[PDB]
């Protein structure tokens, strides 16, 4: 609801609560009521925070080291991590993006999410509900959220505190990852760091150069 | 305070008094803050002109380059001495001052501390205490404070507090006049100045040049001044 967002923001920060200069809590840009917009915005914020904090940890890990499994060193020797991503095989990037899309279409589907006992976030579900992976006859050893258990005995208040902590952590980590990408692309952007370097090509581009693909890889005429 | 000085009275040549209460409170707070900042600036300028260079910068201060604190101090008074610091140092100092100003202007902390209307309105000059409950909860307990960090003013009468506030206002006005005169004497002018007082960087209200992003402005050469 509209009143719940100010309470959640005050729980996240008591000094500054309900900070929306752009408002955005009344723009019904889906035409499905005010609650649907609030649920979409909360889910987008939480997803962006999770992805951004995981990307920050991954950039910190892969900016210095690699994984010794199967010739994963020539790709790690491609300067910046974004150039390493652009230097990965086409099948690798395709399967990674399709894997993430499979997780997204599993989470958003409001019949598997109904098997977990909740609903879609635009229809009253909680913001961020990647559910248990028990829907098909293919026995999975571990699920997505809490893979090696260790969270069954958690309390409701502890869950709410952890949710607020994760929201604030992603709130910081989105700006952190954006600053890392900006310093990678345009030097002198991040004034508190001068160590990260090398170009990223186009940072918002999954396919580049060696990616052949069925046409439409017109990397010519780029922008800033 | 109607008049601390009995031979002066209410001096309002521009008619700024007899206005809305918010404007009067803002003017009083601006006077108090300008006086305090000018007294601190005059003390710091006198200390820098005398020579108080810190025996410091043992690794990590320059940032891989070779820039010692005494090297920054060996340029003058407020002048090329203040204008020779690195861009990160000036930016972080201005950011810390802005964080202090935004904490002072925060109405939630003022209302929790028992103060009055914000933007330094009711009870002007009051800096909220940065400790205890509903403030700075995430680590950073702040063992020191902003005002009375050593408890030097634990007990004071309200009449003594009002007298000290009037003395602070008068001393801050005198220190603002003295700081403006000292900047002028650095630039020349005034009565017979002497005492060297070095040269002047830019003109009086010098800023933090030699930066990047918005500092490519050669416009500071004219505009009369």
């Amino acid at each position: 609801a509209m009143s719940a967002l100010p309470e959640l923001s005050k729980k996240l920060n008591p000094v500054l609560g309900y900070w929306d200069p752009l408002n955005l809590a009344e723009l019904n840009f889906w035409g499905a009521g005010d609650d649907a917009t609030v649920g979409f915005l909360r889910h987008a914020e939480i997803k962006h925070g999770r992805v951004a904090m995981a990307a920050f940890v991954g950039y910190c890990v892969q900016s210095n080291v690699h994984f010794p499994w199967a010739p994963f060193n020539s790709i790690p020797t491609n300067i910046a991590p974004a150039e390493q991503w652009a230097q990965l095989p086409e099948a690798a990037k395709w399967q990674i993006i399709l894997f993430v899309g499979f997780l997204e279409v599993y989470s958003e589907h409001s019949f598997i999410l109904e098997k977990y006992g909740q609903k879609h976030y635009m229809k009253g579900g909680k913001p961020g509900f990647f559910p248990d992976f028990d829907t098909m006859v293919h026995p999975v050893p571990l699920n997505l959220w809490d893979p090696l258990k260790a969270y069954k005995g958690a309390s409701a208040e502890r869950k709410a505190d952890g949710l607020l902590k994760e929201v604030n952590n992603g709130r910081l980590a989105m700006i952190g990852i954006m600053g890392f990408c900006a310093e990678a692309r345009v030097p002198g952007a991040v004034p508190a760091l001068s160590n990260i370097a090398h170009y990223a090509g186009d940072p918002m581009a999954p396919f580049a150069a060696n990616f052949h693909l069925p046409g439409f890889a017109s990397x010519x005429x780029x922008x800033x | 305070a109607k008049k601390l000085n009995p031979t002066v009275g209410l001096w309002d040549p521009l008619g700024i008094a007899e206005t809305s209460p918010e404007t009067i409170g803002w003017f009083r707070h601006a006077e108090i803050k300008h006086g305090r900042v000018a007294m601190a600036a005059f003390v710091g300028y006198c200390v820098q002109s005398n020579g108080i260079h810190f025996p410091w910068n043992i690794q990590g201060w320059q940032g891989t380059p070779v820039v010692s604190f005494a090297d920054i101090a060996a340029a003058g008074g407020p002048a090329d001495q203040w204008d020779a610091l690195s861009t990160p140092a000036k930016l972080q100092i201005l950011g810390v001052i802005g964080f202090l100003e935004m904490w002072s202007e925060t109405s939630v902390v003022l209302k929790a501390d028992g103060q009055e209307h914000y933007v330094r309105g009711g009870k002007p000059g009051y800096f909220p205490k940065l400790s205890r409950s509903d403030e700075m909860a995430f680590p950073h307990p702040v063992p020191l404070n902003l005002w009375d960090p050593f408890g030097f003013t634990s007990k004071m009468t309200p009449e003594r507090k009002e007298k000290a506030l009037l003395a602070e206002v008068n001393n801050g006005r005198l220190a603002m006049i003295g700081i403006f005169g000292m900047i002028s004497a650095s630039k020349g002018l005034q009565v017979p100045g002497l005492d060297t007082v070095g040269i002047k960087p830019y003109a009086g209200e010098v800023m933090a040049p030699f930066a990047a992003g918005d500092a490519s402005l050669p416009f500071v050469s004219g505009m009369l001044e």
Binding site: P21, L22, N23, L24, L27, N28, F29, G31, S218, X221, X222, X223, X224 | -
Partner: protein
């Protein structure tokens, strides 16, 4: 009704001057359209002219000093230092067309009855508030935030504060009209106003012709620029 409101508004604009209508324009029936509609049209024209004059004054200062937004966009074609009349001389011709088209879109939204009845109010020539821009709850696709108050800074002010704001808006608009035409008069005839003599250079083109010096056909677009 409308005339008495004009008398009152002129009183609070300047109590010394008051109602100053030498050329009797508050009595001419323009399109055979009564008194109140004519008064509403005149007030709306005055307020629109004043707002455009204020925005043009600030934009003239920004262009003459040099205040380019950034890269890639239409500021790349305009030379570094050209004076304000020449920044509407080197932007692309399609950029001028689309700027004037968006201004016309805003005018059409301002007088569309469907946009205006969504807020419960009528035309300024039919008993509305002159100079009022409507909200955007009639578009077809939802707009993030409206034009008058883009953020919610307003809407808590008293109606008396709104009336004082309207009076200040009208007075500042008239003064900005005078200032902007002082700029334009110095740019054409030397020594028109005394203070700006030698500050603003001379211009040769026509100020009333939007597309007499047509801009270049430069297509500033990358990534998918299939339209040549």
């Amino acid at each position: 009704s409308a005339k008495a409101d004009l008398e009152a508004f002129a009183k609070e604009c300047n109590p010394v001057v008051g109602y100053w209508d030498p050329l009797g324009l508050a009595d001419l029936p323009l399109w055979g359209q009564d008194q109140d509609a004519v008064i509403g049209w005149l007030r709306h024209s005055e307020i629109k002219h004043g707002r455009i004059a204020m925005a043009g004054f600030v934009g003239y200062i920004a262009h003459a000093n040099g205040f380019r937004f950034g890269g890639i966009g239409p500021q790349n074609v305009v030379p570094e230092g050209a004076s304000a009349p020449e920044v509407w001389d080197s932007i692309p011709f399609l950029a001028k067309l689309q700027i004037i088209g968006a201004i016309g879109v805003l005018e059409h939204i301002s007088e569309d009855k469907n946009f205006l009845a969504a807020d419960g109010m009528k035309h300024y020539m039919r008993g509305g508030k002159p100079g009022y821009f409507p909200t955007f709850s009639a578009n077809v696709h939802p707009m993030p935030l409206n034009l008058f108050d883009p953020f919610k800074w307003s809407k808590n002010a008293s109606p008396e504060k709104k009336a004082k704001g309207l009076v200040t808006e009208t007075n500042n608009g008239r003064l900005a009209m005078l200032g902007l035409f002082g700029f334009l008069s110095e740019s054409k005839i030397p020594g028109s106003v005394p203070a700006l003599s030698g500050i603003i250079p001379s211009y040769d083109g026509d100020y009333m012709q939007p597309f007499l010096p047509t801009g270049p056909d430069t297509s500033l677009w990358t990534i998918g620029n299939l339209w040549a």
